[PDB]
Amino acid sequence: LYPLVKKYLFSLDAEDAHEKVCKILRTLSKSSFLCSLIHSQWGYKNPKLENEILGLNFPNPLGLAAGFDKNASMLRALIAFGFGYLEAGTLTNEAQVGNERPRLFRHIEEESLQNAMGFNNYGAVLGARSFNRFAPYKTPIGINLGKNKHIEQAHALEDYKAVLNQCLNIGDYYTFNLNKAFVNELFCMAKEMTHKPLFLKIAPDLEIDDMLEIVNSAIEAGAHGIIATNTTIDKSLVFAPKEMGGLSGKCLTKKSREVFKELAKAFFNKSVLVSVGGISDAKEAYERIKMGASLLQIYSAFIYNGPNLCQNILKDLVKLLQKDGFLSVKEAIGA
Ligand SMILES: Cc1cc2nc3c(=O)[nH]c(=O)nc-3n(C[C@H](O)[C@H](O)[C@H](O)COP(=O)(O)O)c2cc1C
Numbered sequence: 052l053y054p055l056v057k058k059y060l061f062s063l064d065a066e067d068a069h070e071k072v073c074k075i076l077r078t079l080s081k082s083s084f085l086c087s088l089i090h091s092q093w094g095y096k097n098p099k100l101e102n103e104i105l106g107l108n109f110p111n112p113l114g115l116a117a118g119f120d121k122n123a124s125m126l127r128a129l130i131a132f133g134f135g136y137l138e139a140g141t142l143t144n145e146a147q148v149g150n151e152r153p154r155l156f157r158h159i160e161e162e163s164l165q166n167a168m169g170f171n172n173y174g175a176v177l178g179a180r181s182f183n184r185f186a187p188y189k190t191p192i193g194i195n196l197g198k199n200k201h202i203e204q205a206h207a208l209e210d211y212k213a214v215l216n217q218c219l220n221i222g223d224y225y226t227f228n229l230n231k232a233f234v235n236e237l238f239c240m241a242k243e244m245t246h247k248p249l250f251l252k253i254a255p256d257l258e259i260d261d262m263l264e265i266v267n268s269a270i271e272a273g274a275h276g277i278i279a280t281n282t283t284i285d286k287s288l289v290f291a292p293k294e295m296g297g298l299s300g301k302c303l304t305k306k307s308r309e310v311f312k313e314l315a316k317a318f319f320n321k322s323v324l325v326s327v328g329g330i331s332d333a334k335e336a337y338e339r340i341k342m343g344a345s346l347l348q349i350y351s352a353f354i355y356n357g358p359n360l361c362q363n364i365l366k367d368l369v370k371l372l373q374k375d376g377f378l379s380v381k382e383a384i385g386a
Contacts, residue, residue: 053357065155076125080185089131095362097369099379104323104345105248105275107191107223111135111365112340112380116327116348117195117226121172124181130189133361138348140195141228144214146174147199156295162331162355166282167296170197175217182221194222211237215244224248226278231268238272248275255280255310255328263317276323279314280307300351304329315343333367340383
């Protein structure tokens, strides 16, 4: 039972626990049989959840958010737990340690996390090797690209070019983890290097007008989709000072929802919208889809719910579609 695994893991430092889980996931990824075994217990397939988006086949709309598999080394095991797709990364051009530890904290009663990890990854060269070790994969795989911490904001566009150039032969889409005057050149540069879908991922703490400016520049430069949101630093909760990083999980549900309503209001008919932040159950996921989200992502609820996360949410989602009159998730994406 996962409750016993959680009691053990939650008694450990949160990053230590994550590394013990990554070690097991990397080991399981070596065995396609054990992955097919995992999928038979925790997978869930339903044609009502299938969609084709930007040339790509998503068998369900529920993806694993970036930051869980930063180095593209356990994708096969994670797919076996039922996600419709995975986003690996954030990957940087060169390896990078990230911020000083401790940098991950749990707020267990609130089913939330707080992190200031800062792009710890082994670099794109190794990340492409690790992707290739077990490729091809049974779902789409996104590659989340970032800028190395030291790369000066002058030759910073040239850093997104180097990491994207190193990842050109892996993955099915790219996410850029993000000034309105720079987003146009980023996606213009990127459009000339690959034909694969391009997404902008935004924080949830932008002023709405400032948010509409940034996003609109991205679309007009050729961005194909917007991912909202990353973690928040607005909720000044007493038990989570700001020096411990951004909040994820259920403490993010409300602001992520609010940000996404505004995003959809301005951009639903002009871009693919992906909702992230504090999705833990099928009702919330179904609300995001009805608000305008073609796809979803989860990080924190995977910690708190465990391997049954996907089939729980997806089974319930099917019943919501059927208790609403939709023959598939494609009809539900409407206002
Ligand atoms: C420990 C941790 C590491 C993360 N690392 C990244 C990352 O490397 N790149 C990224 O774009 N988002 C990263 N995220 C953000 C998640 O992808 C997601 O945007 C956020 O956690 C909100 O979703 P959630 O409420 O389902 O957790 C990270 C989140 C956590 C908790």
